[PDB]
Symmetry: C3
Subunit: 209 residues, 3 copies
């Protein structure tokens, strides 16, 4: 397999370098724009430079290890024009991937995650540690599912949706593009575009756009 | 082992056909009363007919893959008179079954579930994906534990109890027959028969009967 | 390896005898002060006597299998003077221990627990079943993390902190010494010393000292 460039040397990039290693991949390094991170390492893996150096590594697979759905979309749209780069799909050896699971390029399925049956993910999704996506779940592009999220059957998550840590989503709930579910929320109603909901039961906090 | 008939071709039957396959079982097919499902398949496995065709398959093990505790009880009482049929016990290879675990016929323990020590389950129980039953937990017959439920030590769950996804139950809590705990509930008090409780902390919503 | 003495023959000691067995350890027995437990067993393992018999077993490793952080501290300070005894570190074969994980003596990591990267634990910590400690998490001494707790990145847990079952802690939150987070709490603010917080979102209930 090609060596991997990880975009993002923060908390998510730290954990995705670990995922890559567990997947048997060689990480060439990170690209990160943070001034303080130039010349730095995570566990023997160098920050090689800024995102505008990505054209130096067309021989590598990429993943965008940045938790914010919008930040991944923005990076793809600016730095990764269609067909110029290839993207890894990283599935932790301890993740459970069942039957009729469809996962598009750039997606990261972390340790202990469970996707049961008939689950569809778009490009550059994240399913973090110990999260569960039950039967018939659909994710759009650039969806972030945080650790321990509980995504019940037939839930639909639009593009650039974020589901916070240990939140719970009732079966058949639809979450429209750009919405965010706070950590620990108990979601029993559909959510409209760009809405942030929090609490038990989940209620509208604010709109993100 | 005998081939398996799965009663219920909905969301739970979909996931239990997957469980059966993972357990090395051959699923002969589903029985389901849904008109729209006659002549249909889940992933190469046929809906063979209606529940009143169950006497055609006495050479098979059965499981009742229907999430509603009352629906499983009703099906057993009408269609499965004592000693006429045999029932599978399905334990996912990725479920953790510890020591002095007692599980009665027809029970389904799904992927990533954990039963630690001194746990007792009655007949036709479901412990769904990533749920944890800690030391001394007792389930009656026809108990449903949804994905990611957190059932602390020495909790007692009566017959036809349902514990919703990612709910949490305080140690030593008793839940009397027929009660339901909403998804995400934080249960710190005993629950009486047929009560539905929701929220954090869990409070009485309504009575189911 | 040395045979193990487990201090505490209650619910936690029951589960830690199971952990020890899974770790390939031989448990010589329990020490427990409970009058009713003298001459009793858990699953072929005897209660040998009271804690003041610990000097009879300097040839054994010890673990303090008592959930209360303060009870472990009190037992260590009274019965286990510095350098007189050795302590086991027990990590369930189904726990995931990632890279640059530092765990001090007497710590118990239970079945399905996940510590990702750059996690530091002090002495006599407990990480119970299916809990997740994400990148950069730091635990002091005598920290209890209950089943299914969701401890996000860069969270700091002081000494004698207790995090209740299936609680969720927002990234970068600091919890000062002696605080307790109720089961199912959604913690989005720092917590001060000896504070008990409950609920969604977590709010001050009382002070423990
Ligand atoms: C490995 C990893 O670490 S992956 C990362 C895992 N982390 C997550 O999933 C955390 C996701 N983040 C959240 O849930 C945040 O709490 C957010 C984004 C919803 C809101 O954060 P902020 O915009 O900083 O909101 P803030 O904390 O200032 O709170 C504003 C109000 O909303 C409430 N609130 C905010 N978040 C939540 C929540 N998750 N649940 C309940 N109430 C909440 C607050 O109580 C406050 O109410 P008030 O006006 O009555 O005081
Ligand atoms: C693989 C799988 O998918 S397995 C399936 C996993 N799914 C589950 O576990 C979900 C279990 N279902 C639930 O928890 C449901 O929310 C139920 C059954 C408790 C209630 O559903 P309904 O009867 O449809 O109640 P409904 O949604 O109309 O809400 C009624 C009231 O209760 C409240 N409420 C309902 N459920 C909950 C909940 N889980 N938590 C908090 N509040 C709740 C609502 O906010 C509403 O309050 P209001 O009167 O102030 O508006
Ligand atoms: C394998 C295993 O079993 S490991 C063990 C796992 N167990 C745990 O993690 C449980 C931890 N314990 C808790 O969370 C407890 O609920 C505690 C310690 C916070 C409080 O317990 P107590 O001191 O007995 O408080 P009590 O139950 O009397 O409730 C007092 C008030 O706080 C509220 N409250 C208490 N705990 C909680 C909670 N976790 N969430 C929300 N509200 C709570 C009650 O609703 C009550 O409010 P009121 O005054 O409005 O009636
Ligand atoms: C949005 C964005 C972020 N970054 C980097 C800056 C930070 O080091 C990193 C984000 O790290 P951090 O803020 O910890 O968040 P995350 O959980 O997504 O890792 O991403 C870029 O290099 N370019 C970008 O366009
Ligand atoms: C109660 C009941 C249900 N069913 C079928 C109808 C539906 O296809 C199926 C239930 O599917 P569904 O409604 O998705 O719920 P579950 O989560 O339990 O699968 O069970 C019967 O065939 N007979 C019965 O007596
Ligand atoms: C605090 C303390 C407890 N114990 C014992 C008494 C009980 O049997 C046991 C605690 O069991 P229990 O009360 O079930 O709680 P836990 O979850 O910690 O097991 O610890 C001692 O023997 N000495 C002590 O100093
Ligand atoms: Na798990
Ligand atoms: Na959870």
């Amino acid at each position: 397999m090609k060596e991997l460039i990880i975009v993002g040397a923060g908390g998510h990039g730290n954990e995705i370098s670990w995922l890559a290693k567990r997947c048997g991949r060689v990480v060439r390094g990170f690209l990160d724009n943070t001034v303080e991170k130039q010349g730095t390492f995570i566990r023997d893996i160098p920050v090689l430079g800024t995102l505008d150096e990505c054209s130096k590594f067309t021989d590598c697979d990429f993943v965008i290890a940045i938790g914010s759905p919008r930040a991944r979309k923005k990076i793809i749209e600016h730095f990764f024009p269609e067909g110029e780069f290839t993207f890894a799909t990283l599935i932790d050896p301890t993740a459970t991937i069942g039957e009729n699971i469809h996962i598009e390029e750039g997606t990261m399925i972390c340790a202990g995650g469970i996707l049961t049956v008939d689950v569809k993910l778009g490009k550059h999704c994240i399913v973090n540690t110990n999260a569960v996506l039950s039967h018939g779940v659909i994710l759009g592009d650039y969806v972030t599912v945080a650790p321990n999220a509980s995504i019940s059957g037939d839930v639909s998550l639009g593009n650039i949706v974020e589901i916070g840590a240990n939140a719970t989503i009732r079966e058949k709930v639809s979450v429209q593009d750009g919405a965010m579910v706070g950590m620990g929320s108990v979601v029993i109603r559909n959510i409209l575009s760009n809405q942030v909901v929090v609490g038990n039961p989940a209620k509208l906090l604010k709109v993100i756009e």
